[PDB]
Amino acid sequence: YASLEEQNNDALSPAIRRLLAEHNLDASAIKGTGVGGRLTREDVEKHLAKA
């Protein structure tokens, strides 16, 4: 953390949406099976590579 309320690990980021364009990949081949259609990162993970 870095403050009094600040928590530990964070989460994802806004770019998570434009991330499809950053790599020039269409979600057409991917599927957002999130709890609410919310395209998660566990769906695009099995498509890119390692990190």
**CA-CA distance, 21 to 8, in Å (whole number)?**
30
Please give the method by which this entry was determined. Answer: NMR
Q: Domain of 12? A: 1-51
What CATH code is carried by the domain that includes residue 19?
4.10.320.10
Q: Which two tokens stand for residue 33?
A: 């099976």
3-state SS, residue 49: coil
Phi, psi of 25 (to 5 degrees): -120, 140
How many domains are there within the chain?
1
CB count, 10 Å around CB of 30? Answer: 15
